[PDB]
Amino acid sequence: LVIPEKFQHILRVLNTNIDGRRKIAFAITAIKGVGRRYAHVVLRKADIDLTKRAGELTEDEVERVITIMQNPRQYKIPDWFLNRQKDVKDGKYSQVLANGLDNKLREDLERLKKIRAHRGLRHFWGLRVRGQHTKTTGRRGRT
Amino acid sequence: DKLNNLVLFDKATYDKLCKEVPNYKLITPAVVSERLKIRGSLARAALQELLSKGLIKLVSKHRAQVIYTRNT
Amino acid sequence: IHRIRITLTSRNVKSLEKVCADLIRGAKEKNLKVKGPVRMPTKTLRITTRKTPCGEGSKTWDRFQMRIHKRLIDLHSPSEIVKQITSISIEPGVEVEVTIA
Amino acid sequence: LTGENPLQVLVNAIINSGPREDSTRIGRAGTVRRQAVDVSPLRRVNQAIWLLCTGAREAAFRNIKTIAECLADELINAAKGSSNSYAIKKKDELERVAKSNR
Amino acid sequence: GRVRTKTVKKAARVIIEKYYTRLGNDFHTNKRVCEEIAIIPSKKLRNKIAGYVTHLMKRIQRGPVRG
Amino acid sequence: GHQQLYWSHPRKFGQGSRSCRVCSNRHGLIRKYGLNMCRQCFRQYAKDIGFIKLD
Amino acid sequence: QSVQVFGRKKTATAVAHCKRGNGLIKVNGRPLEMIEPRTLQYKLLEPVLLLGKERFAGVDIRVRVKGGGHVAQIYAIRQSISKALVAYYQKYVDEASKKEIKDILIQYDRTLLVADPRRCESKKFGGPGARARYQKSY
Amino acid sequence: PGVTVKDVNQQEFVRALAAFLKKSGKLKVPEWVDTVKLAKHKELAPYDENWFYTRAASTARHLYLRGGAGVGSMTKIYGGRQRNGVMPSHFSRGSKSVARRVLQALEGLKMVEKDQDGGRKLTPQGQRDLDRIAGQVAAANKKH
RNA sequence: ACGAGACUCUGGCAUGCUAACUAGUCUUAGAGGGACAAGUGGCGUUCAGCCACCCGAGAUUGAGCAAUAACAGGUCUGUGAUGCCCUUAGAUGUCCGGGGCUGCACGCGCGCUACACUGACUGGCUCAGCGUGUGCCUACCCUACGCCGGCAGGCGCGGGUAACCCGUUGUGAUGGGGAUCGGGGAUUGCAAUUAUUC
């Protein structure tokens, strides 16, 4: 139970710029497509256990999960583990990266804004698209 | 505001902190975690390695407080 | 089969029990072995209704109950004995369903 | 893991840390002082124990030493007869404040 | 409260003056004799009357009572 | 002509298909166990049906 | 010729068929202290160490134990063992020894023979619960 | 002289039976073992790596209690609550495609099969096989 | 003499009782028993009664019903229950039909909601509902396997007038509880967005 790895005070995965304060391997919120049941399924399929020491965990596991996410369609694995599915402009699940870019694409509002629809301006004002009631409850969204 | 503690495994520094725990009156992972201010899981791994050396015996398992003792 | 069942159902325990006892006595006078009564859990027909015909006042509700009791008794006898013991001037309310199965 | 007796600390922190008076309301108005009374030691000791439960919480709630590892402190709270506590010395400060009317 | 209303009080008094011979002190016996000699249309009221007659015999065994 | 209009789209929740069997009242219907009355009419006849206040 | 009393508590129950045989103790149909909840293992160990082996060296007991709730099926097991043991001692040997042993067991604690009478009460009138009421507006 | 297989605490009982079944060595899991959420009250996917053996054994325990237990009532120890956002709850279960895939993987094992009337049924020969195996591994090297 | 109590219903209790081929006397429901301030102490013209304690399943134990005179409280929009002053044909009959009110600078009133090894998944041991359920109407009832992406389920498939079927229904913003909002097959409700759907 002794590892020859050294403690690293500089570690970089996906070219983000965030503070390293708490532990790792489930504070991966900065990493957008790895974690929870999909990562657990991949890890259990990789046949690795929890025998070693916690806290000092490197990024080989997350890199392997990302790499297996690169080409998931070949193995016929159930493809309901990706963010934007059945989207316009591509019938296949294409890869993207970088911070400050996923958030924009989480709301593809360009086409609905173009068609002069009420749902575009429902989304735009930050108000309720499905119609959450907001007159006595539901005042959050701007605080 | 987590503290910075030397966890590096070295030729010299490593074999000076693995022989300081038994030099205290009440030595348990909870007590060492409240007093020496290092994760209790490190103490858990330490007493597990002491078990691996064959000088103690396991009784029960728990994610917080483990039970390894001796009767000799 | 000679297996016959009698289902006695009524809203009160007194008339139902008196009818059951009289039927069991009549069957037992004959040298016949008869299974003991079986008591169903007496399903309760609750109905809650607002008291006020209008919509004024404190919200007050009538809780109406209709308690239906049902008993089954098993025996072995030809039809003539059953239809001779049935016509015994039954007291009102104790509905009788006699089945052969 | 002890081998020895916890009896010493067991007894000698709490079960005579305990206060000896509390305070009660006065007249028909006025919330600026409270008249000093006592209780038969059971109710006073158990009010001190309840505030010590609050203190053990605040030593766990937003703190380092957690719940289900203070068995030494619980045995201290339990056994019999000397003085080392914290919430009970708060209670004793209030003791003196109220007793300033005796 | 356990105040015995006029019904149980009057019943116990009339019971004790009419058949003092049969009635005793042990609640089981008072209940039995009360059922035997009094047409009480309840069971709870019967137990109440028997309890009060037991109390009244505890009263009479140590002096006279005006009722 | 008549059949050119009637039965075009089925009304599977027709409210007007029910009424109080005593006074023909649209509201407060009691369809449970088949009473099919306005609750006021049921209160009027509940004791006669067999429903009683026990609790 | 039917001396059986089983043991029931709250909602759970355990039929304890007690009969003479080789005289060995079988409890829970599973190992002694391995039970999955792990909450109340030590509480079960009071009688087997308080009584001894000679006392239960002739008892063949087979238990049908059912019931959800630790407070229900647990403590029902202890009521069951106490009641079955008391009945067996009363019937098969004498009554003075029964008084001694049963006095010991039910003097260890009282809750053996008494079940809790508390039960959920009816939701009351014009309020979310049995006592709470919908907020009154002025 | 005659042993029932629910003789030990079912944790280690299913552990030993699944150890034997997995050491049979002729069965490998398909690619749709764990990716199923099954019931919403769970947070993750199956991990045991023997969940088929224990699922078949537990179904068997339900079978023992109830004939034709395809619909035998389930028991969920953890909770009576399931708060699911903006609508009330349901009653725990798993997936049906998983059931048929596991039954396709179950053929030739003489463990559990369907019935002509709706539900499941027990394999007596495999029943006695597991009985004898459990008895002769419990009375040989675990208590001697 | 009403009212209060008593009384009915309701839960609480049998090493007891009347018996069921769906449980094995545990579930169901009995002509019945059991508590009464009863036993003992302490307060009470030592009265009515109050406190306490063994004992006991239970020791001010849920509700229902509930006194004349009442009030211009509500109801004529529940009622061929009701006395007639009195409008309009835009009858306040009908016909999957048609704007709203699902606005947000709020004018108000019921409503939707828990702070950390307690909150939440490993799915690794037998759980409860109180109750509902299909033709005088009537055409609308509750529900178990397969096409399989990951289950309600687009179609067949049986059971249930119901105890028989549904159904034994590491020191605090991190991993921890969700601010709008998008994909998978959608339960088949014209329209749901001008309220149905993981």
PDB file of C-alpha atoms in Angstrom, chain A residues 46-131:
ATOM      1  CA  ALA A  46     -12.439  -1.904 -16.270  1.00  0.00           C
ATOM      2  CA  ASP A  47     -12.102  -4.266 -13.261  1.00  0.00           C
ATOM      3  CA  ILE A  48     -10.451  -1.973 -10.709  1.00  0.00           C
ATOM      4  CA  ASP A  49     -11.141  -1.969  -6.961  1.00  0.00           C
ATOM      5  CA  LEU A  50     -10.747   0.438  -4.032  1.00  0.00           C
ATOM      6  CA  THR A  51      -7.789  -1.264  -2.339  1.00  0.00           C
ATOM      7  CA  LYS A  52      -5.421   1.729  -2.534  1.00  0.00           C
ATOM      8  CA  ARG A  53      -5.338   5.002  -0.581  1.00  0.00           C
ATOM      9  CA  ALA A  54      -7.759   7.854  -1.210  1.00  0.00           C
ATOM     10  CA  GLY A  55      -6.991  11.544  -1.579  1.00  0.00           C
ATOM     11  CA  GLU A  56      -3.974  11.004  -3.845  1.00  0.00           C
ATOM     12  CA  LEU A  57      -5.793   9.987  -7.025  1.00  0.00           C
ATOM     13  CA  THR A  58      -4.421  10.845 -10.467  1.00  0.00           C
ATOM     14  CA  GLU A  59      -6.235  11.528 -13.753  1.00  0.00           C
ATOM     15  CA  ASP A  60      -5.562   8.276 -15.637  1.00  0.00           C
ATOM     16  CA  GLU A  61      -9.073   7.024 -14.847  1.00  0.00           C
ATOM     17  CA  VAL A  62     -10.783  10.188 -16.090  1.00  0.00           C
ATOM     18  CA  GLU A  63      -8.579  10.199 -19.200  1.00  0.00           C
ATOM     19  CA  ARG A  64      -9.530   6.581 -19.941  1.00  0.00           C
ATOM     20  CA  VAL A  65     -13.237   7.331 -19.473  1.00  0.00           C
ATOM     21  CA  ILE A  66     -12.967  10.336 -21.806  1.00  0.00           C
ATOM     22  CA  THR A  67     -11.134   8.218 -24.389  1.00  0.00           C
ATOM     23  CA  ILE A  68     -13.794   5.498 -24.237  1.00  0.00           C
ATOM     24  CA  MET A  69     -16.344   8.314 -24.588  1.00  0.00           C
ATOM     25  CA  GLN A  70     -14.566   9.375 -27.789  1.00  0.00           C
ATOM     26  CA  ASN A  71     -15.776   6.281 -29.696  1.00  0.00           C
ATOM     27  CA  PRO A  72     -18.784   4.840 -27.827  1.00  0.00           C
ATOM     28  CA  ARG A  73     -20.942   3.882 -30.812  1.00  0.00           C
ATOM     29  CA  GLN A  74     -18.860   0.890 -31.951  1.00  0.00           C
ATOM     30  CA  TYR A  75     -19.627  -1.369 -28.970  1.00  0.00           C
ATOM     31  CA  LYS A  76     -23.431  -0.820 -29.124  1.00  0.00           C
ATOM     32  CA  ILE A  77     -23.392   0.521 -25.548  1.00  0.00           C
ATOM     33  CA  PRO A  78     -26.729   2.222 -24.668  1.00  0.00           C
ATOM     34  CA  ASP A  79     -26.153   5.760 -25.942  1.00  0.00           C
ATOM     35  CA  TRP A  80     -28.258   7.642 -23.406  1.00  0.00           C
ATOM     36  CA  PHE A  81     -25.281   9.004 -21.433  1.00  0.00           C
ATOM     37  CA  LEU A  82     -24.520  12.089 -23.558  1.00  0.00           C
ATOM     38  CA  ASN A  83     -25.724  15.647 -23.015  1.00  0.00           C
ATOM     39  CA  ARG A  84     -27.291  16.768 -26.314  1.00  0.00           C
ATOM     40  CA  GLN A  85     -28.868  13.907 -28.274  1.00  0.00           C
ATOM     41  CA  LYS A  86     -30.808  13.876 -31.557  1.00  0.00           C
ATOM     42  CA  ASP A  87     -29.801  17.480 -32.211  1.00  0.00           C
ATOM     43  CA  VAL A  88     -30.189  19.441 -35.421  1.00  0.00           C
ATOM     44  CA  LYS A  89     -27.245  19.687 -37.883  1.00  0.00           C
ATOM     45  CA  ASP A  90     -25.853  16.230 -36.953  1.00  0.00           C
ATOM     46  CA  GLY A  91     -27.480  12.836 -36.458  1.00  0.00           C
ATOM     47  CA  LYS A  92     -24.296  11.642 -34.753  1.00  0.00           C
ATOM     48  CA  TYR A  93     -22.955  12.704 -31.360  1.00  0.00           C
ATOM     49  CA  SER A  94     -19.974  14.942 -32.154  1.00  0.00           C
ATOM     50  CA  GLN A  95     -17.397  15.934 -29.550  1.00  0.00           C
ATOM     51  CA  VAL A  96     -16.592  19.429 -28.266  1.00  0.00           C
ATOM     52  CA  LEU A  97     -14.462  20.854 -25.468  1.00  0.00           C
ATOM     53  CA  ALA A  98     -13.279  24.029 -23.682  1.00  0.00           C
ATOM     54  CA  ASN A  99     -14.969  25.973 -20.884  1.00  0.00           C
ATOM     55  CA  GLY A 100     -17.319  28.873 -21.466  1.00  0.00           C
ATOM     56  CA  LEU A 101     -18.723  26.967 -24.452  1.00  0.00           C
ATOM     57  CA  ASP A 102     -20.898  24.126 -23.099  1.00  0.00           C
ATOM     58  CA  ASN A 103     -23.177  26.595 -21.301  1.00  0.00           C
ATOM     59  CA  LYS A 104     -24.035  28.418 -24.530  1.00  0.00           C
ATOM     60  CA  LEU A 105     -24.811  25.183 -26.382  1.00  0.00           C
ATOM     61  CA  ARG A 106     -27.008  23.899 -23.541  1.00  0.00           C
ATOM     62  CA  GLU A 107     -29.645  26.273 -25.010  1.00  0.00           C
ATOM     63  CA  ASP A 108     -29.650  26.201 -28.829  1.00  0.00           C
ATOM     64  CA  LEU A 109     -31.989  29.177 -29.109  1.00  0.00           C
ATOM     65  CA  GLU A 110     -30.871  30.508 -32.506  1.00  0.00           C
ATOM     66  CA  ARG A 111     -33.346  28.625 -34.710  1.00  0.00           C
ATOM     67  CA  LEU A 112     -36.344  29.243 -32.436  1.00  0.00           C
ATOM     68  CA  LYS A 113     -35.453  32.934 -32.200  1.00  0.00           C
ATOM     69  CA  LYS A 114     -35.266  33.049 -36.001  1.00  0.00           C
ATOM     70  CA  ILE A 115     -38.699  31.515 -36.620  1.00  0.00           C
ATOM     71  CA  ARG A 116     -40.353  34.349 -34.646  1.00  0.00           C
ATOM     72  CA  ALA A 117     -41.747  32.071 -31.929  1.00  0.00           C
ATOM     73  CA  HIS A 118     -42.900  32.837 -28.397  1.00  0.00           C
ATOM     74  CA  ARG A 119     -40.658  30.112 -26.944  1.00  0.00           C
ATOM     75  CA  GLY A 120     -37.533  32.011 -27.989  1.00  0.00           C
ATOM     76  CA  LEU A 121     -38.518  35.027 -25.902  1.00  0.00           C
ATOM     77  CA  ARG A 122     -39.732  32.661 -23.182  1.00  0.00           C
ATOM     78  CA  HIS A 123     -36.169  31.338 -22.946  1.00  0.00           C
ATOM     79  CA  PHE A 124     -34.497  34.720 -23.467  1.00  0.00           C
ATOM     80  CA  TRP A 125     -35.965  36.634 -20.513  1.00  0.00           C
ATOM     81  CA  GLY A 126     -34.896  33.837 -18.156  1.00  0.00           C
ATOM     82  CA  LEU A 127     -38.563  33.194 -17.363  1.00  0.00           C
ATOM     83  CA  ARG A 128     -40.599  30.018 -17.466  1.00  0.00           C
ATOM     84  CA  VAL A 129     -40.704  28.094 -20.752  1.00  0.00           C
ATOM     85  CA  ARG A 130     -42.898  25.211 -19.593  1.00  0.00           C
ATOM     86  CA  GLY A 131     -44.890  27.613 -17.426  1.00  0.00           C
TER      87      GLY A 131
END
